[PDB]
Paper text:
[name]/[name] ([name]) is a cytoskeletal Ca2+-binding protein identified in human immune, brain and mast cells. [name] and EFhd1 consist of a disordered N-terminal region followed by two EF-hands and a coiled-coil domain at the C-terminus. We also reported previously that the EF-hands of [name] are involved directly in F-actin bundling in a Ca2+-dependent manner and the coiled-coil domain is essential to the F-actin bundling activity by homodimerisation. Based on the experimental results, we propose that the F-actin bundling activity of [name] depends on structural rigidity conferred by binding of two Ca2+ ions to the EF-hand domains.
We failed to determine the structure of the apo form of [name] owing to structural instability during protein purification; however, we could determine the crystal structures of CDEFhd2 mutants defective for one Ca2+-binding site (E116A for EF1, CDEFhd2EF1; E152A for EF2, CDEFhd2EF2). The overall structures of these two mutants in the presence of Ca2+ are similar to that of Ca2+-bound CDEFhd2 (CDEFhd2EF1, root mean square deviation (RMSD) = 0.34 Å for 102 Cα atoms; CDEFhd2EF2, RMSD = 0.61 Å for 105 Cα atoms), which implies a single Ca2+-loaded EF-hand is sufficient to maintain a stable fold. Although the crystal structures of EF-hand mutants (CDEFhd2EF1 and CDEFhd2EF2) are similar to Ca2+-bound CDEFhd2, we observed structural flexibility in the Ca2+-binding loop of EF1 and the C-terminal linker. Furthermore, comparison of the crystallographic B-factors between Ca2+-bound and EF-hand mutant structures showed that the largest changes in B-factor values were for CDEFhd2EF1 (35.6 Å2), CDEFhd2 (20.4 Å2) and CDEFhd2EF2 (21.5 Å2). To evaluate the effect of Ca2+ on structural dynamics of [name] at the atomic level, we performed ensemble refinement for CDEFhd2, CDEFhd2EF1 and CDEFhd2EF2 using Phenix.ensemble refinement. As expected, Ca2+-bound CDEFhd2 displayed a rigid conformation and CDEFhd2EF1 showed the largest degrees of mobility, indicating that Ca2+ depletion of EF1 has a larger impact on conformational dynamics. Interestingly, the C-terminal linker (residues, 176–184) followed by the LM-helix also showed significant RMSF increases in CDEFhd2EF1 and CDEFhd2EF2. Consistent with a previous study showing that thermostability of [name] was restored by Ca2+ at a high temperature, the half aggregation temperature for both EF-hand mutants that bind only one Ca2+ is significantly lower (CDEFhd2EF1: 62.32 ± 0.14 °C, CDEFhd2EF2: 57.90 ± 0.60 °C) than the two Ca2+-bound [name] (CDEFhd2: 84.89 ± 0.01 °C) and is consistent with ref. Even depletion of one Ca2+ site in a two Ca2+-binding protein showed a dramatic reduction in F-actin bundling activity to a level that is similar to that of previously reported data for a two Ca2+-depleted state26.
Numbering used by the authors: 80 to 105, 109 to 184
The structure:
């Protein structure tokens, strides 16, 4: 898993910023309770099911937790125009330090 060749739409700086965010809200996985805390600190808490739905959207290996690759997939979906307006994932991407739409 080389995120640098898989996610060519993000600069190395963007990917490293995404990694800094990932490591912070962290074994290398962000589970539901970790995602809950992250949305709380960001100022936008989500419901239990809202968090589960955020994970489900990018959980490509179906273990109900987010690897770094799947975290990057959130930003890929955001930058591809695939997230629903004001969805939990849209809100995470917006409130992160990371601008992907320009
Ligand atoms: Ca997963």
């Amino acid at each position: 898993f080389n995120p640098y060749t898989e996610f060519k739409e993000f600069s190395r700086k963007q990917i490293k910023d995404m990694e800094k965010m990932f490591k912070q809200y962290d074994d290398g996985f962000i589970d539901l309770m970790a995602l809950k805390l992250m949305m709380e600190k960001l100022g936008a808490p989500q419901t239990h099911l809202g968090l589960k739905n955020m994970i489900k959207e990018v959980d490509e290996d179906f273990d109900s937790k987010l690897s770094f690759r799947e975290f990057l997939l959130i930003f890929r979906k955001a930058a591809a125009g695939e997230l629903q307006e004001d969805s939990g994932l849209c809100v995470l991407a917006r409130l992160s330090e990371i601008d992907v739409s320009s």
